[PDB]
Amino acid sequence: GQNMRVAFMPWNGYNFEDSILVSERVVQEDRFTTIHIQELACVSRDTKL
């Protein structure tokens, strides 16, 4: 994964029950951006019609 500055303190209840608060910086720096590759299939059969 990635490593970054980590604090330990409640923040207005946004980390109330195991919740995790992040920055706009990590999104801007694309630290946790990932790539997912899907595939699709178009079956073409010979129907009696």
Partner: protein, 50 residues
């Protein structure tokens, strides 16, 4: 950039993360000194000593 709830530390009995956090700050402090002296280029030998 990331704030974690501290209440989940004692009750969950996971204190290795605190040591990991302190050691991470130590390593990043080393890095912040290293790049600081790298941007100034005091001496290669001085870097080799530090």
């Amino acid at each position: 950039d990331i704030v974690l709830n501290p209440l989940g530390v004692p009750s969950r009995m996971n204190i290795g993360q605190i040591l990991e956090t302190h050691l991470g700050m130590a390593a990043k402090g080393i890095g912040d000194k290293i790049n600081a002296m790298l941007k100034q280029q005091q001496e290669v030998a001085k870097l080799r000593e530090f």
